[PDB]
Design a protein around this ligand. Sequence first.
Ligand code: HEM
Length: 451
Amino acid sequence: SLPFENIQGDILVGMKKDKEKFVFFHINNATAFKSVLKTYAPANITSVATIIGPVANQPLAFVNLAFSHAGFGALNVTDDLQDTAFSDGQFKDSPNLGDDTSTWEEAFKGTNVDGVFLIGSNDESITAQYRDDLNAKFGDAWTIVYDLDSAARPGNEKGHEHFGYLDGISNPTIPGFGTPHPGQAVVDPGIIFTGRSKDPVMNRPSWALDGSFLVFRKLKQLVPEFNKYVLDNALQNQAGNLTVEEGAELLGSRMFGRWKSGAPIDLSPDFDDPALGNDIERNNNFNYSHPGSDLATDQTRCPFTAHIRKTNPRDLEGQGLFGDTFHAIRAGTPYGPEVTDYEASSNTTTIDRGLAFVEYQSVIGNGFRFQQQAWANNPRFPFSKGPSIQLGLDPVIGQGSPRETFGLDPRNASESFTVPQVIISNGGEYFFSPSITAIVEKFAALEHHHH
Ligand code: HEM
């Protein structure tokens, strides 16, 4: 069993707070920075145990902390983690993601970002308080280079991302941690936590035990553009009696793999079933297999290129073509206000909004990076399908090539959809979230005891 009082809570369970502030910073004075850390971190870095334990022992805001490769250097900590993406930094790595850095937030366009504080609470007043407190204690020892507020959407769209789809449904868990939901992935702890069982870096340093790599991406979303696209390309059933609005929601469900309620189209392909989508016990219990259906050719229930089927090809893994290597935990939060009447009427975005995307994994190259580059951006993934069956890009997040996706029309797998870019990367950075002791014992090391 893992020491959940030593593991940063946002990795495994998520902060699950309505408001999440991301404080990206540069380190100006390592000695003064470590000094603050020595007392701040044991008092404020929120553990898994605190998040899942009694509400009585929870602070007003949860706080997590992660460092970039550049931050390691600024703290005189050797990067011996053996993660090539992490060491490169996301800006250098960005061509491999299909990013055009002309759309990046300026603060990310380099290696100036040394780390990030995650602050989760129920009111932006409290996250601002915790930020102000950090500013007061660090003083001139740091500079906040980017300060991003994210918030869960309001009302019955709480838990949904800005396109309207229920999010945070499918994430892996580990053996012995609570009860897995039907269809939920149960992966070896070393796929999420560095140094734990079946960590693919068998060489992993001891101090890194129970850390994880935090990938951050600011992903801007063009919601009216997306809505106008699916309306303009609305699908039809064989009966031919779908309205344009009904065919548009069908097409959206085919792009994602789920209806907006969360109902997986593999279980409910013809119409939304909001009771299914909302039910934790039903909404993830699928693997794309069906009696009488050829996994190699049948896209009538879910296109091979649907977002969730690109990023978690359950059928390929379930056939044993590979293992649980490529699962990772998402813990991001939507950012920006709701779509305004003007934006909707004009089919045009005027306000920045999107997803403050966070994904945790023991190997960046096996989680986020593989899901993006090897799968979403790969026009010949998934492999093992019929040799003439055209595939193309993930129609939600796929980039790097012409955004052509096949198989979205259930009546004609051959029909191509050229989907406008509705998600624009504003960049981010790769970080490492150490264990809580590692924060104090390594990153805040004030003396020079030899080892
Ligand atoms: C604004 C950007 C994005 C949006 C709106 C979005 C939306 C969604 C939605 C609605 C789901 C289904 C809910 C769920 O299964 O939990 C989902 C699942 C998922 N997404 Fe995304 N996503 C975005 C970016 C990304 C990126 C960049 C990656 C990885 C490179 C990714 C990987 C995944 C994974 C692994 C799942 C779970 C699939 C499964 O286990 O079946 N997403 N996403």
